[PDB]
Design an enzyme around this catalytic site. Sequence first.
Site, PDB file in Angstrom:
ATOM      1  N   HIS M  61      46.909  72.887  35.925  1.00 21.93           N
ATOM      2  CA  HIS M  61      48.381  72.346  35.445  1.00 21.93           C
ATOM      3  C   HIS M  61      48.596  70.704  36.249  1.00 21.93           C
ATOM      4  N   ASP M  91      44.558  37.499  33.876  1.00 19.85           N
ATOM      5  CA  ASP M  91      44.137  38.943  33.594  1.00 19.85           C
ATOM      6  C   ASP M  91      43.284  39.175  34.782  1.00 19.85           C
ATOM      7  N   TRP M 126      46.309  73.555  43.649  1.00 22.75           N
ATOM      8  CA  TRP M 126      45.459  71.801  43.137  1.00 22.75           C
ATOM      9  C   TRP M 126      45.778  71.385  44.608  1.00 22.75           C
ATOM     10  N   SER M 156      38.121  56.225  41.173  1.00 23.22           N
ATOM     11  CA  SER M 156      38.772  55.523  39.669  1.00 23.22           C
ATOM     12  C   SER M 156      39.980  54.846  40.232  1.00 23.22           C
ATOM     13  N   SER M 157      40.407  55.240  41.515  1.00 21.25           N
ATOM     14  CA  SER M 157      42.106  54.813  42.109  1.00 21.25           C
ATOM     15  C   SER M 157      41.085  53.993  42.923  1.00 21.25           C
ATOM     16  N   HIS M 240      49.953  63.446  51.452  1.00 19.36           N
ATOM     17  CA  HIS M 240      51.627  62.889  51.102  1.00 19.36           C
ATOM     18  C   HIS M 240      51.516  61.469  51.163  1.00 19.36           C
ATOM     19  N   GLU M 242      50.130  61.030  49.046  1.00 19.31           N
ATOM     20  CA  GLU M 242      49.785  60.962  47.076  1.00 19.31           C
ATOM     21  C   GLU M 242      51.422  60.594  47.128  1.00 19.31           C
ATOM     22  N   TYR M 244      54.276  59.574  47.581  1.00 20.86           N
ATOM     23  CA  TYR M 244      54.497  58.136  47.492  1.00 20.86           C
ATOM     24  C   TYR M 244      54.080  57.599  46.292  1.00 20.86           C
ATOM     25  N   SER M 255      63.750  50.195  39.345  1.00 26.67           N
ATOM     26  CA  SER M 255      64.406  48.658  39.608  1.00 26.67           C
ATOM     27  C   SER M 255      64.808  47.587  38.175  1.00 26.67           C
ATOM     28  N   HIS M 290      54.503  68.524  58.164  1.00 29.95           N
ATOM     29  CA  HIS M 290      55.219  68.802  57.405  1.00 29.95           C
ATOM     30  C   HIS M 290      55.274  69.902  56.284  1.00 29.95           C
ATOM     31  N   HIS M 291      53.536  70.201  55.804  1.00 32.30           N
ATOM     32  CA  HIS M 291      53.507  70.450  54.537  1.00 32.30           C
ATOM     33  C   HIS M 291      52.364  71.850  54.874  1.00 32.30           C
ATOM     34  N   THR M 316      65.112  55.369  51.975  1.00 33.02           N
ATOM     35  CA  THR M 316      65.342  55.822  50.469  1.00 33.02           C
ATOM     36  C   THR M 316      66.797  55.245  49.827  1.00 33.02           C
ATOM     37  N   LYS M 319      67.872  52.127  48.685  1.00 33.35           N
ATOM     38  CA  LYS M 319      66.926  52.145  47.160  1.00 33.35           C
ATOM     39  C   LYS M 319      68.147  52.051  46.132  1.00 33.35           C
ATOM     40  N   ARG M 438      55.425  80.870  45.920  1.00 38.17           N
ATOM     41  CA  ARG M 438      55.300  80.201  44.605  1.00 38.17           C
ATOM     42  C   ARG M 438      53.244  81.006  44.132  1.00 38.17           C
TER      43      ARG M 438
HETATM   44  C1  HEA Z   1      53.598  64.636  37.639  1.00 37.58           C
HETATM   45  C2  HEA Z   1      53.678  66.280  38.185  1.00 37.58           C
HETATM   46  C3  HEA Z   1      54.828  67.823  37.212  1.00 37.58           C
HETATM   47  C4  HEA Z   1      55.141  67.412  36.431  1.00 37.58           C
HETATM   48  C5  HEA Z   1      55.512  66.913  35.027  1.00 37.58           C
HETATM   49  C6  HEA Z   1      55.316  69.207  35.958  1.00 37.58           C
HETATM   50  C7  HEA Z   1      56.497  69.496  34.570  1.00 37.58           C
HETATM   51  C8  HEA Z   1      56.418  71.089  35.029  1.00 37.58           C
HETATM   52  N1  HEA Z   1      56.133  71.855  35.766  1.00 37.58           N
HETATM   53 FE1  HEA Z   1      54.669  71.932  37.204  1.00 37.58          FE
HETATM   54  N2  HEA Z   1      54.366  71.274  39.043  1.00 37.58           N
HETATM   55  C9  HEA Z   1      53.225  70.967  39.352  1.00 37.58           C
HETATM   56  C10 HEA Z   1      53.510  69.595  38.972  1.00 37.58           C
HETATM   57  C11 HEA Z   1      54.340  68.815  37.645  1.00 37.58           C
HETATM   58  N3  HEA Z   1      54.797  69.525  37.132  1.00 37.58           N
HETATM   59  C12 HEA Z   1      52.462  70.279  40.842  1.00 37.58           C
HETATM   60  C13 HEA Z   1      52.190  69.746  41.729  1.00 37.58           C
HETATM   61  C14 HEA Z   1      52.712  72.425  40.928  1.00 37.58           C
HETATM   62  C15 HEA Z   1      51.837  73.209  42.017  1.00 37.58           C
HETATM   63  C16 HEA Z   1      50.938  73.237  41.575  1.00 37.58           C
HETATM   64  C17 HEA Z   1      50.225  74.441  43.376  1.00 37.58           C
HETATM   65  O1  HEA Z   1      51.045  75.283  43.638  1.00 37.58           O
HETATM   66  O2  HEA Z   1      49.078  74.843  43.195  1.00 37.58           O
HETATM   67  C18 HEA Z   1      53.560  72.405  39.940  1.00 37.58           C
HETATM   68  C19 HEA Z   1      53.713  73.815  39.862  1.00 37.58           C
HETATM   69  C20 HEA Z   1      54.785  74.117  38.384  1.00 37.58           C
HETATM   70  C21 HEA Z   1      55.212  75.570  39.021  1.00 37.58           C
HETATM   71  C22 HEA Z   1      55.220  76.619  39.853  1.00 37.58           C
HETATM   72  C23 HEA Z   1      53.629  77.593  39.196  1.00 37.58           C
HETATM   73  C24 HEA Z   1      53.634  79.041  40.898  1.00 37.58           C
HETATM   74  O3  HEA Z   1      53.651  78.591  41.746  1.00 37.58           O
HETATM   75  O4  HEA Z   1      53.587  79.928  40.585  1.00 37.58           O
HETATM   76  C25 HEA Z   1      56.000  76.063  37.672  1.00 37.58           C
HETATM   77  C26 HEA Z   1      57.001  77.076  36.740  1.00 37.58           C
HETATM   78  O5  HEA Z   1      57.602  77.183  36.130  1.00 37.58           O
HETATM   79  C27 HEA Z   1      56.244  74.630  37.042  1.00 37.58           C
HETATM   80  C28 HEA Z   1      56.489  74.063  35.868  1.00 37.58           C
HETATM   81  C29 HEA Z   1      56.289  73.358  34.921  1.00 37.58           C
HETATM   82  C30 HEA Z   1      56.779  73.123  33.999  1.00 37.58           C
HETATM   83  C31 HEA Z   1      57.890  74.076  32.428  1.00 37.58           C
HETATM   84  C32 HEA Z   1      56.993  71.696  33.699  1.00 37.58           C
HETATM   85  C33 HEA Z   1      57.349  70.163  32.659  1.00 37.58           C
HETATM   86  O6  HEA Z   1      58.969  70.388  32.968  1.00 37.58           O
HETATM   87  C34 HEA Z   1      56.868  69.512  31.674  1.00 37.58           C
HETATM   88  C35 HEA Z   1      57.698  69.302  30.485  1.00 37.58           C
HETATM   89  C36 HEA Z   1      56.430  67.802  29.307  1.00 37.58           C
HETATM   90  C37 HEA Z   1      56.513  66.770  30.205  1.00 37.58           C
HETATM   91  C38 HEA Z   1      56.728  66.692  31.820  1.00 37.58           C
HETATM   92  C39 HEA Z   1      55.851  65.234  30.073  1.00 37.58           C
HETATM   93  C40 HEA Z   1      56.003  64.141  28.949  1.00 37.58           C
HETATM   94  C41 HEA Z   1      55.508  62.812  28.735  1.00 37.58           C
HETATM   95  C42 HEA Z   1      54.112  62.380  28.405  1.00 37.58           C
HETATM   96  C43 HEA Z   1      52.837  63.714  28.069  1.00 37.58           C
HETATM   97  C44 HEA Z   1      54.169  61.423  28.838  1.00 37.58           C
HETATM   98  C45 HEA Z   1      53.983  60.730  27.795  1.00 37.58           C
HETATM   99  C46 HEA Z   1      53.314  59.791  28.050  1.00 37.58           C
HETATM  100  C47 HEA Z   1      54.016  58.074  27.199  1.00 37.58           C
HETATM  101  C48 HEA Z   1      54.349  58.706  25.685  1.00 37.58           C
HETATM  102  C49 HEA Z   1      52.777  57.129  27.254  1.00 37.58           C
HETATM  103  N4  HEA Z   1      54.783  73.760  37.432  1.00 37.58           N
HETATM  104  C1  HEA Z   2      57.613  62.282  43.722  1.00 41.01           C
HETATM  105  C2  HEA Z   2      56.879  62.929  44.409  1.00 41.01           C
HETATM  106  C3  HEA Z   2      57.661  63.453  45.950  1.00 41.01           C
HETATM  107  C4  HEA Z   2      58.631  63.048  46.792  1.00 41.01           C
HETATM  108  C5  HEA Z   2      58.821  61.583  46.462  1.00 41.01           C
HETATM  109  C6  HEA Z   2      59.072  63.517  47.135  1.00 41.01           C
HETATM  110  C7  HEA Z   2      59.635  63.706  48.405  1.00 41.01           C
HETATM  111  C8  HEA Z   2      60.654  64.464  49.767  1.00 41.01           C
HETATM  112  N1  HEA Z   2      59.855  65.210  50.314  1.00 41.01           N
HETATM  113 FE1  HEA Z   2      58.713  66.301  49.100  1.00 41.01          FE
HETATM  114  N2  HEA Z   2      57.661  68.163  47.539  1.00 41.01           N
HETATM  115  C9  HEA Z   2      56.526  66.983  46.981  1.00 41.01           C
HETATM  116  C10 HEA Z   2      56.660  66.322  45.876  1.00 41.01           C
HETATM  117  C11 HEA Z   2      57.251  64.919  46.605  1.00 41.01           C
HETATM  118  N3  HEA Z   2      58.144  65.060  47.296  1.00 41.01           N
HETATM  119  C12 HEA Z   2      55.155  67.963  46.419  1.00 41.01           C
HETATM  120  C13 HEA Z   2      54.560  68.058  44.499  1.00 41.01           C
HETATM  121  C14 HEA Z   2      55.262  68.989  47.191  1.00 41.01           C
HETATM  122  C15 HEA Z   2      54.836  70.304  47.337  1.00 41.01           C
HETATM  123  C16 HEA Z   2      53.516  70.181  47.475  1.00 41.01           C
HETATM  124  C17 HEA Z   2      52.565  72.046  47.468  1.00 41.01           C
HETATM  125  O1  HEA Z   2      53.016  72.280  48.324  1.00 41.01           O
HETATM  126  O2  HEA Z   2      52.210  71.534  46.103  1.00 41.01           O
HETATM  127  C18 HEA Z   2      56.134  68.933  48.066  1.00 41.01           C
HETATM  128  C19 HEA Z   2      56.927  68.915  48.625  1.00 41.01           C
HETATM  129  C20 HEA Z   2      57.050  68.486  50.603  1.00 41.01           C
HETATM  130  C21 HEA Z   2      57.609  69.553  51.839  1.00 41.01           C
HETATM  131  C22 HEA Z   2      56.567  70.684  52.202  1.00 41.01           C
HETATM  132  C23 HEA Z   2      57.839  72.241  52.139  1.00 41.01           C
HETATM  133  C24 HEA Z   2      57.234  72.857  51.467  1.00 41.01           C
HETATM  134  O3  HEA Z   2      55.578  73.529  51.890  1.00 41.01           O
HETATM  135  O4  HEA Z   2      57.140  74.463  52.888  1.00 41.01           O
HETATM  136  C25 HEA Z   2      58.486  68.573  52.259  1.00 41.01           C
HETATM  137  C26 HEA Z   2      58.913  69.160  53.816  1.00 41.01           C
HETATM  138  O5  HEA Z   2      59.479  68.346  54.497  1.00 41.01           O
HETATM  139  C27 HEA Z   2      58.959  67.785  51.516  1.00 41.01           C
HETATM  140  C28 HEA Z   2      60.088  66.881  52.274  1.00 41.01           C
HETATM  141  C29 HEA Z   2      60.090  65.995  51.574  1.00 41.01           C
HETATM  142  C30 HEA Z   2      60.603  64.320  51.825  1.00 41.01           C
HETATM  143  C31 HEA Z   2      62.524  64.515  52.788  1.00 41.01           C
HETATM  144  C32 HEA Z   2      60.791  63.449  50.352  1.00 41.01           C
HETATM  145  C33 HEA Z   2      61.432  62.371  51.168  1.00 41.01           C
HETATM  146  O6  HEA Z   2      60.737  61.403  50.451  1.00 41.01           O
HETATM  147  C34 HEA Z   2      62.727  62.796  49.449  1.00 41.01           C
HETATM  148  C35 HEA Z   2      64.027  61.291  50.277  1.00 41.01           C
HETATM  149  C36 HEA Z   2      65.111  60.639  48.961  1.00 41.01           C
HETATM  150  C37 HEA Z   2      66.544  61.244  49.604  1.00 41.01           C
HETATM  151  C38 HEA Z   2      66.683  61.787  50.443  1.00 41.01           C
HETATM  152  C39 HEA Z   2      67.233  60.671  48.321  1.00 41.01           C
HETATM  153  C40 HEA Z   2      68.138  59.511  48.554  1.00 41.01           C
HETATM  154  C41 HEA Z   2      68.449  59.314  49.641  1.00 41.01           C
HETATM  155  C42 HEA Z   2      70.160  58.595  49.274  1.00 41.01           C
HETATM  156  C43 HEA Z   2      70.973  59.738  48.846  1.00 41.01           C
HETATM  157  C44 HEA Z   2      70.449  58.414  50.668  1.00 41.01           C
HETATM  158  C45 HEA Z   2      71.447  59.302  51.693  1.00 41.01           C
HETATM  159  C46 HEA Z   2      70.779  60.193  52.069  1.00 41.01           C
HETATM  160  C47 HEA Z   2      70.758  61.071  53.080  1.00 41.01           C
HETATM  161  C48 HEA Z   2      71.552  60.656  54.423  1.00 41.01           C
HETATM  162  C49 HEA Z   2      69.860  62.688  53.724  1.00 41.01           C
HETATM  163  N4  HEA Z   2      58.412  67.530  50.794  1.00 41.01           N
END
Ligand code: HEA
Ligand code: HEA
Lengths: 105, 43, 84, 79, 46, 144, 227, 98, 73, 259, 58, 49, 514
Positions: M61, M91, M126, M156-157, M240, M242, M244, M255, M290-291, M316, M319, M438
């Site tokens: 997933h 291009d 993952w 690729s990326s 991390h 990744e 961003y 924007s 932090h992870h 952030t 923005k 989890r």
């Molecule tokens: C981009 C990242 C992404 C997205 C979108 C989602 C979407 C969803 N995920 Fe998540 N999920 C993860 C990334 C994501 N997930 C990650 C990283 C983990 C942790 C893995 C790990 O523990 O190792 C995770 C783990 C995770 C868990 C925890 C499993 C566990 O700890 O046991 C659950 C549980 O409910 C969950 C549920 C869902 C559900 C119901 C959705 C639904 O909201 C999905 C609904 C469908 C969509 C959002 C798709 C829509 C769009 C398209 C196909 C695009 C179409 C494109 C064009 C038309 C060009 N996911």
């Molecule tokens: C699109 C993906 C995405 C993004 C952008 C971020 C953004 C952030 N994430 Fe997260 N994060 C994930 C995807 C992402 N994360 C995933 C996939 C995991 C789990 C990985 C795994 O274990 O599988 C995860 C896990 C994760 C962890 C580890 C938790 C754990 O496993 O125990 C933490 C901890 O610090 C973290 C923190 C943050 C913070 C501080 C930001 C900051 O960048 C967010 C900053 C944004 C804002 C704060 C809001 C806007 C701001 C305002 C309106 C300003 C005013 C606000 C203040 C004064 C506070 N994230």
Amino acid sequence: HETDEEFDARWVTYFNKPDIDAWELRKGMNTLVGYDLVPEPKIIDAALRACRRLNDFASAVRILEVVKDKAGPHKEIYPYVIQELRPTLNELGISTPEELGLDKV
Amino acid sequence: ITAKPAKTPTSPKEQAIGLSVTFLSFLLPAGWVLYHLDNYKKS
Amino acid sequence: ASAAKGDHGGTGARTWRFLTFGLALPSVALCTLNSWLHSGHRERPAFIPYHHLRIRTKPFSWGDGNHTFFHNPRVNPLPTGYEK
Amino acid sequence: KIKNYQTAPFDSRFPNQNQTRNCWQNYLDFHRCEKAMTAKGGDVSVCEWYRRVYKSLCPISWVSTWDDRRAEGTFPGKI
Amino acid sequence: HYEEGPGKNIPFSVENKWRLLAMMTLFFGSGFAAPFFIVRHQLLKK
Amino acid sequence: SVVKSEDYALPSYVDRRDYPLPDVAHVKNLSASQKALKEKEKASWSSLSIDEKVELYRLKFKESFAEMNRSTNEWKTVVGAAMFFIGFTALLLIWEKHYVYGPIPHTFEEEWVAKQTKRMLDMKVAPIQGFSAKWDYDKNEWKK
Amino acid sequence: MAYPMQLGFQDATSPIMEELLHFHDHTLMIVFLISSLVLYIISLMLTTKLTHTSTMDAQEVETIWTILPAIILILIALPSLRILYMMDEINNPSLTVKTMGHQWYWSYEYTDYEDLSFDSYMIPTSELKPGELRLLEVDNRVVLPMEMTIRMLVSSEDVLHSWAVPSLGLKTDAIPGRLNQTTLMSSRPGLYYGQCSEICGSNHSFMPIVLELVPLKYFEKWSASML
Amino acid sequence: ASGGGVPTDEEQATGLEREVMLAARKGQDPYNILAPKATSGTKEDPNLVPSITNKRIVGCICEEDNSTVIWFWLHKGEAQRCPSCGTHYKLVPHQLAH
Amino acid sequence: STALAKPQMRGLLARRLRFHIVGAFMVSLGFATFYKFAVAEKRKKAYADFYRNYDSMKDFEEMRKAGIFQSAK
Amino acid sequence: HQTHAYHMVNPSPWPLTGALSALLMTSGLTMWFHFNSMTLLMIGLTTNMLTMYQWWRDVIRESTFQGHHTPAVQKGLRYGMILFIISEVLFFTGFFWAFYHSSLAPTPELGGCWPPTGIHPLNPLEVPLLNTSVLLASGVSITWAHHSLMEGDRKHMLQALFITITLGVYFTLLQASEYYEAPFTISDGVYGSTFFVATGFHGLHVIIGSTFLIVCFFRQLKFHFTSNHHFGFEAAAWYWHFVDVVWLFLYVSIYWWGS
Amino acid sequence: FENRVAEKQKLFQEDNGLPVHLKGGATDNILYRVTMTLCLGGTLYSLYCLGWASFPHK
Amino acid sequence: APDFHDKYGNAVLASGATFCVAVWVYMATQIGIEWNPSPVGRVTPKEWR
Amino acid sequence: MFINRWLFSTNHKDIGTLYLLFGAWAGMVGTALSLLIRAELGQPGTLLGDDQIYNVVVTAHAFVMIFFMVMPIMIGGFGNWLVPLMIGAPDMAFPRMNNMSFWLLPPSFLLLLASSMVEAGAGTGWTVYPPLAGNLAHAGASVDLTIFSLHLAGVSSILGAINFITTIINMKPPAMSQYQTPLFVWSVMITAVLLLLSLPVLAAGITMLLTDRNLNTTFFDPAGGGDPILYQHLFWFFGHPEVYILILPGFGMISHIVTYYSGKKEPFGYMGMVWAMMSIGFLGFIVWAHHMFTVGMDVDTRAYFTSATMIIAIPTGVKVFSWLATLHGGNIKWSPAMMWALGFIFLFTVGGLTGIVLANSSLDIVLHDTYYVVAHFHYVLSMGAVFAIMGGFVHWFPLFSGYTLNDTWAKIHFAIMFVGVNMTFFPQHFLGLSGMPRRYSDYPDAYTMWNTISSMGSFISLTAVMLMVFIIWEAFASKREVLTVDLTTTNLEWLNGCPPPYHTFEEPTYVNLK
Ligand code: HEA
Ligand code: HEA
Ligand SMILES: CCCCCCCCCCCCCCCCCC(=O)OCC(COC(=O)CCCCCCCCCCCCCCCCC)OC(=O)CCCCCCCCCCCCCCCCC
Ligand SMILES: CCCCC/C=C/C/C=C\C/C=C\C/C=C\CCCC(=O)O[C@H](COC(=O)CCCCCCCCCCCCCCCCC)COP(=O)(O)OCCN
Ligand SMILES: CCCCCCCCCCO[C@@H]1O[C@H](CO)[C@@H](O[C@H]2O[C@H](CO)[C@@H](O)[C@H](O)[C@H]2O)[C@H](O)[C@H]1O
């Protein structure tokens, strides 16, 4: 920047140019409605007479509509502006959007 | 944006068929698998 | 440093050839002497079956599974010791 | 002779969450001390403190693996 | 050189909306069905 | 009147309330009477009738401000359709519960839960606010 | 343990868990306020016909919306870091206990005086006794003296696991080859539950932790009877 | 120490690379490598926009340091004005294949 | 028949903005005050009240009599 | 006809064959590692070499033969090569990170010391010092090559470039011999693991750089380079200095400081 | 060696409509066919291997 | 001329709302879903030991 | 003709379209995998089997949604279509290497499908942590297939990123400085710099895992002196940046979409937007541990990672406020694209703020490896990244296709998806505070209520996904051709018509220096 009176005088001068062309008329109205204000009657007056020298009746009417639109929910503004423009409307035979039925949805 | 009227309009009836065929294409295979889960587990 | 030589008027082919033959190749020839001199076999150490060495968690994908890729019978013992 | 042991006390050389080196160091110290006593013809009982500390701290499988490796000649620390 | 314009800059035909429906169904449907069949394959293994 | 795809690079007509004077007239070509009306527009506008004034406006522009800004009933269709598909979702969940989900664990049976709940209270689960805090140990009943 | 329809943390059982609750309340207040402010401003920007579309000057306002958040972060970081340094201070434990994670069960070692160790396995659902909790009970509980500072040491003998008890604020990874330390102090007697908190294979869901906290004198007799 | 045997660009460059090098010696820019300089932009003194067809896209950076560029097709005919600052442009079509 | 008075015609957007942002700030202090009373103070007082007279031995004796422990019958 | 200076590339099959060859190599290493067969891997290695050969032949066709590399094209290739090299520096960074992590806190299994108990390191003043002088020398001779080329001197360009390649090859042979002679192997704990993986990826990059230099040698034999336009040779010189710099870091970290 | 770059420039600039990868003549087509056949054949083989590896060989 | 929403709007909204509410009510109450609500104020504790 | 065009492409638009088709197909696989997760969890007891199969599904997933859905769509798909049009380039710098980045993905995806078909799958998370992912606890080919899948997606990326950086630095009009390029172009260049630096580190770490599994190295094996924790540092040093990478191109599209439907000619505070994205990209390289707050790291290390992580809220929040300030005074057009962007602003903010809660290492001790983290990241990913993608898709579909969507259907689709994702993820905050871990196939009975509601949410999102397919079909079936588009003077990608010719900017734009 500048006072309100200097802003208005600059816009009055813009539209009062005797040989203002169609492009300048449009540019001046399309720019002017980007601001956070409803233009003073004396500005609209100079823009309506510019419509007259360009022989464009329809744009005179459209300028009245856009005054009403820039006022948003402040419903007292448009009737006040039309009131102040009446001698110019009368002199140039400009009918308002209401007298034309162009306020109906 | 403005656009032309449809070159090949899709009536309400046609949209109902496209929508139904779309949802079936997702529901039926997954439904078939999940319905048979018990024959898989104990097999 | 500045190293300890001199030139710099212009950095041309002639200068860099001067350095290839006057400094770089002679250093290679010196290190080559020095090495082909400290060579010839050093004695292999007594075998001790330490558990952090000669790791085998999965047979290697070649030979009999138990020989490293550049196995040298003289100096690489197997996990049960040096070969016959 | 200065007893009432409850458990290993805080030791400022190993203040953090990873305590692996604390276990290892007292295991070494005990066995170094026991070797020095059994050399110079003397009393192993002065080593007892290290034995108490490492027994408190060290997982039984680590002690047991280190004891087998010392008996086999494959223990990699210096005793 | 290639066809330009709406319906011509894509690798699939949209000349006929029903053939298109069938192709879109096979395409999205195969992606959607696959994990269910893989789960099935895994259950049926051991 | 008729807008053509091969006109894309040309200035075009648009009804927008923040761009009230668009780059071209809505109607470029004029009939005989529309040409006479454009000539008449060069003389005093008081001589134009209401009909003539309207027709000049409709040459220059397509919809008035009131027309282009009007509200629609689209929200009804959108909110109603969304509720319909959300309702269809429950059909999926009813099918899943009937054909896919088997009996739940025996620990949710009513007598099990009653016993478990007692034991949670005897062990004082969450006694400060969350759980046993809501039980009255003097009157042997849930706090009202 | 957790109870049905729970919203927040399990009630705190240690002074540290209590600090975490108050610090979470302070943080969540700031969270709710910021996201309410954002939703509110959004709706404010979208509910007027008045327009202003010309170029807008950015420098004045960027100050406020850079210095306000910096100050708010500081108001989070201060109590957050005070608690960090608390959970790390020297304390003098009376007792050390080791737990080793395995696939899939925990073993425990209390080797300050005697060689006491035992394995701790989930009670299978078909063998629960009436009133017992599915997936949470173990055959052999981790009995510990209440009101005393205990050093726990955690490691693994196979893959990663993680040893957690939400009530006490504890979670320490169990890593083979490493000995991680944490301190545990329960303010009350009773039974405190946790679950393995690092994916470790087929029975990850099924290797819980149950601590049984009792008076020292009952702890000493239990220790003796487990040898 | 030194001799020759290495071809020069003058001797061996070909295709588009040679065209750009030969145009550059003549001070010309048929492949648009340089930014043109603005005239005053009035109707008497319009920016002159070369093209090989009858329209070209212009981007106007109205004031120095604007981050926003204003884009529009400039057509053959009378001078057109930037829809944001009014500066004048005129298309001067044709040629290139020397 | 009487003329209409001149209304405010300038800065209507900025004026609406200023009014509502000040509104939003006053509401925010109102919510911070409410939240410290209904959630945060209520929490600190629950813990303080629970523990002020808490008897842990007596708590244990009730648990032990209710049969909950492996190590204490 | 275009009136910008950029290159519109003819539609090409090599991106697809290169992608498939990546599938064949990876599913091939899997086959080799788990199903005792080398067949896929050998087919993947083959199609990979064929793809690289034709792809780069075609870049030569477009530039030397067809004139598509205007200054703006060439400038883009400069950026691309610099970025590529940056990505390779980060790849090595993760191996240096592995090495320092294991050697700075040596665990009890190793004896709690570095080098581990029972590891006998190479003497850094013997063949590793020779290697260092070899690759530093080849950075001098390749710079002589570059200046000869810019000065239009065909014969000294070929001679300096030949000397550079012979030194790459000598480095490679010295290192193959040192691998054979080393008393520790890849399976000797984290010492052998960090040693062989870091030096081995390095040795592979030395082979890749030597190959690229050999390609420049033959293109220069065929007069492809002008005294002013020779990006292939520059890219190979940059890559070559990269390989030298990585070696200096390995020598200082693993052979000298880690001994 | 003499400089024969000019002959190659004339060959590769011939206006025969050929993409650069085939512009060398008959040998380009052969090498292409060999490459694409090994890639397609070897991809089919990898699918067969995946099918074989997907089932226990008990 | 009335568009789709003028002619069908009210009906789409009324039918969609009614159908959604009915099928979710049926799903939530009539097919044996275990919601596991809190026992607080609902369950009478029973002797387990 | 067909093969030359679609397999041998060197055209940025057609390659952009291939990536969009690929990411749409990945999206279906991803969604199916998420519905299996939520069918298992929607009732207490065991639906599928023990944790191995369940976590094979959880693992796949995440890899599908990240690497095959979100990255190909945002960078491959939107970046290829729009970036050259937005700078008036003919291009990409490397149009043939661009095509190889694309074709490396179907085989990367095939290796991932393979890994789930063979043996018992890779049930590793993952993150693929050892020793669970090592050759003892995951013997056989699954984990090696998973590593090779990441190596191909990596290559690729990385080649993608070199192509974008070069194209964006080198192929602008000579008068356009970097501070005259649109924000979306900025967001892709910054994303590309993060890919370039972070993927090679991941490649090194998973290569070490490959050699631990097959060459008897012991980088992560304590018996040979290695350290499982080392792998976590290497992995998160990539992981991390990744996250961003997954959101930055989304911020760039937001924007443009907010500016456009507010009737503005430019985003508020351009240089503050640029500064904010560069600062986020920079700070994103110094916060990874932090992870790792429960692995037993020293206290001062945990204090530094907590504080440095929090600081990201500053740029952030710039923005977010600048997006609000762009709406302010707009002539707001309520297009379906604008609704996705407004949902994005609010729901991304919510998820960013729960990220700030997790950044506090003290509280993370209790939240780590529970559903509170799952709630955080699905707000920013399945609401943030996804809503940006859906907004960009509905906005630019008429440019890519020359055809309009039915906007009423697209608004119905938005309303469904909005209710479904919030119903799925909002209650997971409660499951996480109350301690549900989890990567569990089953849970203690007290967590039933929120899990049941969360599973019902996911089915609502499935219905939205299915509707989206039908909406795309309807647009292509009815063929309403685009006639005029507004604001072309500040949206150059539309100015060549819809769709633009195969070759655009053969004659470059004229831009003078003044
Ligand atoms: C981009 C990242 C992404 C997205 C979108 C989602 C979407 C969803 N995920 Fe998540 N999920 C993860 C990334 C994501 N997930 C990650 C990283 C983990 C942790 C893995 C790990 O523990 O190792 C995770 C783990 C995770 C868990 C925890 C499993 C566990 O700890 O046991 C659950 C549980 O409910 C969950 C549920 C869902 C559900 C119901 C959705 C639904 O909201 C999905 C609904 C469908 C969509 C959002 C798709 C829509 C769009 C398209 C196909 C695009 C179409 C494109 C064009 C038309 C060009 N996911
Ligand atoms: C699109 C993906 C995405 C993004 C952008 C971020 C953004 C952030 N994430 Fe997260 N994060 C994930 C995807 C992402 N994360 C995933 C996939 C995991 C789990 C990985 C795994 O274990 O599988 C995860 C896990 C994760 C962890 C580890 C938790 C754990 O496993 O125990 C933490 C901890 O610090 C973290 C923190 C943050 C913070 C501080 C930001 C900051 O960048 C967010 C900053 C944004 C804002 C704060 C809001 C806007 C701001 C305002 C309106 C300003 C005013 C606000 C203040 C004064 C506070 N994230
Ligand atoms: C779907 C299931 C909902 C279940 C409801 C709970 C039942 C109560 C029982 C009965 C109540 C009995 C009293 C017991 C009190 C126990 C106190 C406690 O232990 O304390 C801890 C609790 C306290 O939390 C709560 O008190 C419930 C939170 C509700 C927040 C308001 C949003 C609600 C929106 C609408 C429904 C959600 C779907 C859409 C949400 C959209 C995402 C925000 O735990 C949490 O942390 C969860 C919060 C997650 C953090 C994300 C916050 C950001 C939210 C966004 C702001 C929206 C702003 C405007 C307001 C938004 C207007 C739209
Ligand atoms: C002479 C210097 C030149 C180096 C090249 C050597 C030739 C062998 C094959 C090529 C290896 C190149 C890549 C680096 C890979 C790792 C190990 C290689 C270094 C090496 O060659 O180490 C040897 C072990 O090699 C072994 O296992 C060999 C294992 C051979 C199988 C190759 C491993 C294949 C898997 C690599 C996957 C690559 C992933 C790359 C992704 C790139 C990022 C996108 C040392 O031999 P030993 O007997 O243990 O000790 C010496 C005792 N007398
Ligand atoms: C997570 C996404 C999935 C959500 C739920 C999907 C809803 C499923 C839609 C219906 O799927 C069908 O359901 C049938 C039963 O309703 C199955 O018939 C099965 O049962 C029948 C009747 O009980 C027999 O008639 C058939 O032969 C037998 O295969 C049939 O195979 C299956 O395609």
